[PDB]
């Protein structure tokens, strides 16, 4: 898990989409992200480089 997580210290950019809860990483925050096709899943934090398998992966999160 990690602990009691919520929007505290974290800046989430709209354009570069970089997100850091670590205050040191906001001081080192460098806006410039080549974000072609990458989708992070909340629980399965490993990023998917494809949209189609991601859609089938959401079907895996869908109940009956
Ligand atoms: Zn940024
Ligand atoms: Zn997932």
From Swiss-Prot:
Up-regulation conditions: Up-regulated by transcription factors, such as MASH1, NEUROD1, NEUROG3, NGN3 and TCF3.
Domain of life where this protein originates: Eukaryota
Zinc finger residue extent: C2H2-type: 11-31, 39-61
TM stretches of this protein: none
Tissue and organ distribution: Expressed in pancreatic duct cells. Expressed in several tumor cell lines of neuroendocrine origin including pheochromocytoma, medullary thyroid carcinoma, insulinoma, medulloblastoma, retinoblastoma, pheochromacytoma, medullary thyroid carcinoma and small cell lung carcinoma.
Compartmental location: Nucleus
Domain notes: The C-terminal region is necessary for NEUROD1 promoter DNA-binding and transcriptional repressor activity.
Function (record text): Sequence-specific DNA-binding transcriptional regulator that plays a key role in neurogenesis and neuroendocrine cell differentiation during embryonic and/or fetal development. Binds to the consensus sequence 5'-[TG][TC][TC][TT][GA]GGG[CG]A-3' in target promoters. Acts as a transcriptional repressor of NEUROD1 and INS expression via its interaction with cyclin CCND1 in a cell cycle-independent manner. Negatively regulates skeletal muscle-specific gene expression in endocrine cells of the pituitary by inhibiting the Notch signaling pathway.
Subunit structure: Interacts (via the SNAG domain) with HDAC1. Interacts (via the SNAG domain) with HDAC2. Interacts (via the SNAG domain) with KDM1A. Interacts (via the SNAG domain) with RCOR1. Interacts with SORBS1. Interacts (via the N-terminal region) with CCND1 (via cyclin N-terminal domain); the interaction competes with the binding of CCND1 to CDK4 during cell cycle progression and increases its transcriptional repressor activity. Interacts with HDAC3; the interaction increases its transcriptional repressor activity.
Family per similarity comment: Belongs to the INSM1 family.
Protein name: Insulinoma-associated protein 1
Natural source organism: Homo sapiens
Gene this chain is encoded by: INSM1
């Amino acid at each position: 898990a990690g602990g009691a997580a919520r929007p505290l210290g974290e800046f989430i950019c709209q354009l570069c989409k970089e997100e850091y809860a670590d205050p040191f990483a906001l001081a080192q925050h460098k806006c410039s992200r080549i974000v072609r096709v990458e989708y992070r899943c909340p629980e399965c934090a490993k990023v998917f480089s494809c949209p189609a398998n991601l859609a089938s992966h959401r079907r895996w999160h869908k109940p009956r």
